[PDB]
Nucleic acid binder design. Structure first.
Ligand SMILES: [Mg+2]
Ligand SMILES: [Mg+2]
Ligand SMILES: [Mg+2]
Ligand SMILES: [Mg+2]
Ligand SMILES: [Mg+2]
Ligand SMILES: [Mg+2]
Ligand SMILES: [Mg+2]
Ligand SMILES: [Mg+2]
Ligand SMILES: [Mg+2]
Ligand SMILES: [Mg+2]
Ligand SMILES: [Mg+2]
Ligand SMILES: [Mg+2]
Ligand SMILES: [Mg+2]
Ligand SMILES: [Mg+2]
Ligand SMILES: [Mg+2]
Ligand SMILES: [Mg+2]
Ligand SMILES: [Mg+2]
Ligand SMILES: [Mg+2]
Ligand SMILES: [Mg+2]
Ligand SMILES: [Mg+2]
Ligand SMILES: [Mg+2]
Ligand SMILES: [Mg+2]
Ligand SMILES: [Mg+2]
Ligand SMILES: [Mg+2]
Ligand SMILES: [Mg+2]
Ligand SMILES: [Mg+2]
Ligand SMILES: [Mg+2]
Ligand SMILES: [Mg+2]
Ligand SMILES: [Mg+2]
Ligand SMILES: [Mg+2]
Ligand SMILES: [Mg+2]
Ligand SMILES: [Mg+2]
Ligand SMILES: [Mg+2]
Ligand SMILES: [Mg+2]
Ligand SMILES: [Mg+2]
Ligand SMILES: [Mg+2]
Lengths: 260, 155, 188, 131, 167
RNA sequence: GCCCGUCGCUAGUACCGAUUGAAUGGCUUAGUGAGGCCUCAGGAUCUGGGA
RNA sequence: GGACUUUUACUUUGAAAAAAUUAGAGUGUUCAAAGCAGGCGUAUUGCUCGAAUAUAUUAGCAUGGAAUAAUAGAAUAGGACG
RNA sequence: UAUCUGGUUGAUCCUGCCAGUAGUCAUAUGCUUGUCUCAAAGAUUAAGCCAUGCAUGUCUAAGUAUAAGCAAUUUAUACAGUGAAACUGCGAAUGGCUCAUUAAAUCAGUUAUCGUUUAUUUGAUAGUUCCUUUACUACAUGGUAUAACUGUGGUAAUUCUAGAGCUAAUACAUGCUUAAAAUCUCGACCCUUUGGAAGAGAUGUAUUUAUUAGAUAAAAAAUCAAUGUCUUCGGACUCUUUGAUGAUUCAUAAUAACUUUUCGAAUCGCAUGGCCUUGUGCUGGCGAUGGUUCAUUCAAAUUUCUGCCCUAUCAACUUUCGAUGGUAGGAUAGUGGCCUACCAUGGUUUCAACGGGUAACGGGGAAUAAGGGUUCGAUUCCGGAGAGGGAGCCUGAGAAACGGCUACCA
């Protein structure tokens, strides 16, 4: 309908943000960026709706424009900048670092990380092509382009990215039995090693997954994000470790911790 | 369809960028290109052995099979190089908790690599639009003749 | 302007269809270049998304390659003699892809006799070396060698003059040349 | 273009308009818990109706089916919470019983009277509204 | 009041479709064209005003015209225009040839000059140097990273050759 | 006792009906055809063949 | 990796899947329709639970079943294996 | 949350409808009306018509300041603060509103691009630009023509503008530059071998064409033409380099050329330091704006499978002037009868085509509570369409735009 759409009616806004139905009408429409609209957490949301550091949206621009906030290393000043999964958000003042990884409910959690871990990030490589002049490149889920990767890096492998400098320093192949983080679907936020891949030529590979509770599920290969070895992630996980408790199990945990 | 002639158009029929150098004396006159369409569809031998041209041929032409896979049952072979199949299908109606017979005709391209007749069951594979109505291209014959030669004269 | 929608047009059933929405520019069409021969005239058309397309109307030289010889020269286009689509393109000498044209020969003759030292139809040092190194390899082809005597060579336009602004092509050869030769006289 | 405000109505009117047995039965309640409306009874019968519908449904599911266990237990402790469901009878075939009067005898207007403090439900009403 | 328009010919008035960069129309909006009445270029008794331009001077002076003279509002601003308006050669340094306009502040007289442009200055030359530098500095950096990869490829081949001679 | 139809009064509805009756809306033949676009020209003026 | 595969219906489990609505959990908006809040302290420089679940049916995808109901098979053998 | 009752008879049991009863995010109207919270609302009829006002404008240290503007102090005799106006850039293609059209259309779920365009955001990305290549090309940086303005004017009348005189750039228009290397072609010469050579040109990216590489289905041999590297000069060639997809003529590269030749920074702001042969030399900090190609993101455009209300007092329909297919072209961002040539005779239908109706936008949904159903959805979210009716088009990444233009009709 004539051109690019610029608004977003709250209600059409993605749910994992947790915005209230009333109080306004629109939700902030995520800028074009390194993460898709529907799977992103705009800076406005993070600074005010999660960290509670700002009350106004107008106060969020106030915070940002002093370059207090900086994403994956760079300063960044875009109220609705599309922060996304694996990104690293930093506040120099307040000496605070953050990673965007998922809940178990499929929400972006406030997860505090050490200055040391704020060094780097993890990127799923999403395609590996031959660039102009024969220079091979990889391209990761957050749309970084990295020239001259290791030949043994293929698609779906995950990659340790420097940040300070753009380079790669490692890569975990997509083998049977490797720590996986689920990034979409219902099983969003669950974690579980990998059992086996259903091939399916020309239409969606299924990836059978089992966690550290001997529980099993299945997602499309698209939704699967390797992050290390069973036992050994390559980043700190949120509390929960992505195990998914039954509504009963959750009930009891909450009503077992009852006495003030 | 094709049959005979092959060089029977106003334009000279050729496979693009498949050059045969006249300087180099060859023993097969014309260099021929083909692929396999994938999804484990055998490129039949008439496609390679052949000399027909068809740039809408799944195996010797510039189409690709991607998308859907449909198996219909062929109900008309009157159009040169294209067929119409009847897709055989069956359809539920909740209020009455029974079904009702339905059908849909589909037009599909058919390479001279295949030799289809009315009655054959035919597996078709989706491709880019190829004509006003055709979005499908034969790809494999599950049939044969449907007991034709088993109907000759008396004893 | 010219719409390329399908939504005019009867449905495969034979049914008539109602108008739903007006013409959109993104289904638009433009008019034919109908490019002719001689004295360079080329206009740009502004296409979708920024982007130029070059409408050659009138052209006198194109870049033409002698496939089997692995070289390509720029020549005058003498022009048109056979067209598979429409014979008025020929009579009007109109330039389009697939047009059979005659080109010039002289640039290909100069090359060949410089490269082979053999001359078509009818004393340097290393040059002698190279020529003698070639041949058993200079054996041309009957129906091409004969074209040079007339100073005019058959060629199939292979570019799209109305889109690219270039009128480029290859020299006819082998069976393909045989083919248009046969038409060229089985109609003359 | 703003989120709709959701509402619900909270009562239900009896089909037969003039059934004197039901009409007596309703009035007695009105004068026994100091109500002002047939609606204040119509309301509770509606609250009940769904609680019962809920319970009915769960009962049709298997003994110790996950949903049954989760939402059934939850429904019970909610009911126990306010004092409609007695402690002993605590497993939903009794909520399946229950009764309008059980819900009534837990209103603040009645509890204010039940232990002294008012002596007559009507004094008890007047006291409540008057802050 | 309708204006004349060079080129139309005609001694009447006509309505024309005008564009950007044409007389008798100032477009309000990019790509806007308006249809507008226009008077022809040929003179006739219908004209309220003829616009003449003395090309050369008669035998006598015309009062408020040849006997009064009014100076150009603005002086040369761009570096070389200052050069040509005084004929100077790139040696003389413009800075002092730039014109200066006086203005009184009651009991203060101020002097304000333009701001020369395309004037060659230290700051510019520094930015020329710098870009020249980056192009080369990158170029060499870009060569290294290739060679180092060629290494990674070379001694990978040297793993698949001490492997393919192990078993 | 019941009860059928023509005939007569009031009121209502629909039907047939000269008027080759009327009206609105959607498509459309043939004829005429604005305008922008594309194109063969043109060349007030104004440059270095071009605008 | 090569070489080939009689067709279907039905059923199962799962994936992919907007929110709001709906069913429904948690939480005393004073109640309630709602809302998605809120709750604890050192109430002087903070601690903390949430923001579930279900449904989502026809068609398409993916996995298990082999009853029921169809299809096809070797009889002028142009049958089957090697 | 599985209920019925009144009325045909003298009375009776039925069939059967009328009436009662109950709800309605269901509208109107009548009467009556105190408090809290909540809060729909010119859809239905007339996508009928509209007085006036408002609803789209916009500036950072960082494109353009000689306001004959304001301000003065504070280092500023080029400029330097602040800033009207104007140029330039960007935006006005979002939003908001309505439901007229629309019945295989749209829409939903599910697909496809190996079928394309894509401002912007994000990440990558450029040593090649000149020239018969010693008396040399502005790089210490090349060209004017214009607004605002001054001043002369025209009309009853508008966001009308004319003649004259100025002056800017990240507007317009031009136009230099940088290492080493390797490979190709030519070849002055010398010498006959088995044969080699000084030095001459060409090789950025993009555009167009033609050509070749892009292997791999397990292993080996001979010969013909050209021609590689190493000679223990009969001869050997040993190790020989390979990306992605289910699938490609894919990504990428190589050869011969082609082009009214695309891009390859003449831009701006803060800082002013190092280095010695003391040239105002040579270096050099942070980050703005820009820029080609690729990727990403926001998109778009088409597209697969299945699903629509009433209707036979609609049975055959489709090619007038494309209906269904084949070939070639043209056009398009691109597939395609999209359009044009040639050729053929196809395409749909009782499993309801084709035609008609709809007081028809689709969907999420709403009402009604045993279950199965029935009715509704102009309308808070998604999709589509429109801006009195039609068509045409300029700008632009994006519009067939209407708070844009153009014509016709009202
Ligand atoms: Mg935004
Ligand atoms: Mg796919
Ligand atoms: Mg035919
Ligand atoms: Mg034309
Ligand atoms: Mg400047
Ligand atoms: Mg299911
Ligand atoms: Mg939900
Ligand atoms: Mg009676
Ligand atoms: Mg009676
Ligand atoms: Mg009697
Ligand atoms: Mg009734
Ligand atoms: Mg309304
Ligand atoms: Mg209206
Ligand atoms: Mg000033
Ligand atoms: Mg809108
Ligand atoms: Mg000029
Ligand atoms: Mg520019
Ligand atoms: Mg080989
Ligand atoms: Mg390979
Ligand atoms: Mg290619
Ligand atoms: Mg200094
Ligand atoms: Mg009728
Ligand atoms: Mg009949
Ligand atoms: Mg065709
Ligand atoms: Mg004709
Ligand atoms: Mg016919
Ligand atoms: Mg019917
Ligand atoms: Mg309607
Ligand atoms: Mg609706
Ligand atoms: Mg409806
Ligand atoms: Mg309506
Ligand atoms: Mg519109
Ligand atoms: Mg109106
Ligand atoms: Mg019309
Ligand atoms: Mg319009
Ligand atoms: Mg508008």
């Amino acid at each position: 309908a004539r051109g690019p759409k610029k608004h977003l009616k709250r209600l059409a806004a993605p749910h994992h943000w947790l915005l209230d139905k009333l109080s306004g009408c629109y939700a902030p429409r995520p800028s074009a960026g390194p993460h898709k609209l529907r799977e992103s957490l705009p800076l406005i949301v993070f600074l005010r709706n999660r960290l509670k550091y700002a009350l106004n949206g107008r106060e969020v621009k106030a915070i940002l424009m002093q370059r207090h906030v900086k994403v994956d290393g760079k300063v960044r000043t875009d109220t609705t900048y599309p922060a996304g999964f694996m990104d690293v958000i930093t506040l120099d003042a307040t000496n605070e670092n953050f990673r965007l990884v998922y809940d178990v409910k499929g929400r972006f959690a406030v997860h505090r990380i050490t200055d040391e871990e704020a060094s780097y990030k993890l990127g799923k490589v999403k395609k590996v092509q031959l660039g102009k002049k024969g220079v091979p490149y990889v391209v990761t889920h957050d749309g970084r382009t990295i020239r001259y990767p290791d030949p043994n890096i293929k698609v779906n492998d995950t990659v340790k990215i420097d940040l300070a400098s753009g380079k790669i320093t490692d890569f975990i192949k997509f083998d049977a039995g490797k720590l996986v983080y689920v990034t979409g679907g219902r099983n969003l936020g669950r974690i579980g090693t990998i059992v086996h891949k259903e091939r399916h030529d020309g239409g969606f590979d299924l990836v059978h997954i089992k966690d550290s509770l001997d529980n099993t599920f299945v997602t499309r290969l698209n939704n699967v994000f390797v992050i290390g070895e069973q036992g050994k992630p390559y980043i700190s996980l949120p509390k929960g470790k992505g195990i998914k408790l039954s509504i009963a199990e959750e009930r009891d945990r909450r009503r077992a911790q009852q006495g003030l | 369809s094709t049959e005979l002639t092959v060089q029977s158009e106003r334009a000279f029929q050729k496979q693009p960028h498949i050059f045969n150098n006249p300087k180099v004396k060859t023993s097969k006159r014309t260099k021929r290109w083909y692929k396999n369409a994938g999804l484990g569809f055998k490129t039949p031998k008439t496609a390679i052995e052949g000399s027909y041209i068809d740039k809408k041929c799944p195996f010797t032409g510039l189409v690709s099979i991607r998308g859907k896979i449909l198996t219909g049952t062929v109900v008309s072979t009157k159009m040169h190089r294209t067929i119409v199949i009847r897709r055989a299908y069956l359809h539920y109606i909740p209020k009455y908790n029974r079904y009702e017979k339905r059908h849909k005709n589909v037009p599909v391209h058919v390479s001279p690599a295949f030799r289809v007749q009315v009655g054959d069951i035919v597996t078709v594979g989706q491709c880019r639009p190829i004509s006003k109505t055709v979005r499908f291209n034969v790809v494999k014959v599950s049939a044969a003749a449907a007991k034709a030669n088993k109907q000759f004269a008396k004893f | 302007g010219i719409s390329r929608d399908s939504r005019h047009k009867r449905s495969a059933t034979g049914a008539k269809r109602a108008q739903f929405r007006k013409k959109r520019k993104f289904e638009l069409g433009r008019q034919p270049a109908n490019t002719k021969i001689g004295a360079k005239r080329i206009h740009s058309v502004r296409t979708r998304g920024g982007n130029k397309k070059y409408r050659a109307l009138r052209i006198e030289t194109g870049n033409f390659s002698w496939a089997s010889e692995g070289i390509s020269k720029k020549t005058r286009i003498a022009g048109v003699v056979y067209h598979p689509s429409n014979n008025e393109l020929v009579r009007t000498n109109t330039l389009t892809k697939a047009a059979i044209v005659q080109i010039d020969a002289t640039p290909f003759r100069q090359w060949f006799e410089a490269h082979y030292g053999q001359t078509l139809g009818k004393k340097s040092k290393n040059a002698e070396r190279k020529w003698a190194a070639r041949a058993a390899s200079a054996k041309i082809e009957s129906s091409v060698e004969s074209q040079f005597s007339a100073g005019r060579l058959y060629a199939c336009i292979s570019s799209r003059p109305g889109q690219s602004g270039r009128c480029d092509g290859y020299i006819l050869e082998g069976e393909e040349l045989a083919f248009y030769l046969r038409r060229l006289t089985a109609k003359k | 273009p703003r989120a709709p405000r959701t509402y619900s109505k909270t009562y239900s009117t009896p089909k037969r308009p003039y059934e004197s047995s039901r009409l007596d039965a309703e009035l007695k309640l009105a004068g026994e818990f100091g109500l002002k409306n047939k609606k204040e009874i119509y309301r509770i019968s509606f609250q009940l109706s769904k609680i019962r519908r809920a319970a009915r449904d769960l009962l049709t599911r298997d003994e110790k089916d996950p949903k049954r266990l989760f939402e059934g237990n939850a429904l019970i402790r909610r009911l126990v919470r306010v004092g409609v469901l007695s402690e002993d009878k605590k497993k939903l075939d009794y909520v399946l019983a229950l009764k309008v009067e059980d819900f009534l005898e837990r209103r603040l207007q009645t509890q204010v009277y039940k232990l002294g403090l008012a002596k007559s439900v009507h004094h008890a009403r007047v006291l409540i509204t008057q802050r | 009041g309708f204006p004349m328009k060079q080129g139309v010919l005609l001694p009447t008035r006509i309505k024309l479709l005008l564009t950007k960069n044409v007389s008798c129309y100032r477009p309000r909006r990019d790509g806007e064209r308006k249809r507008k009445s226009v008077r022809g270029a040929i003179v006739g008794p219908d004209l309220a005003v003829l616009a003449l331009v003395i090309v050369k001077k008669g035998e006598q002076e015309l009062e408020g015209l040849t006997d009064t003279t009014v100076p150009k509002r603005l002086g040369p601003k761009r570096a070389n225009n200052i050069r040509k308006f005084f004929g100077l050669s790139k040696e003389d340094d413009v800075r002092d040839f730039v014109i200066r306009r006086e203005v009184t502040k009651g009991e203060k007289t101020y002097t304000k000059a333009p701001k020369i442009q395309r004037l060659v200055t230290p700051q510019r030359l520094q930015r020329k140097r710098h870009q020249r530098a980056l192009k080369v500095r990158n170029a060499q950096a870009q060569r290294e990273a290739a060679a180092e990869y060629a290494q990674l490829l070379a001694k990978r081949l040297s793993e698949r050759k001490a492997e393919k001679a192990e078993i």
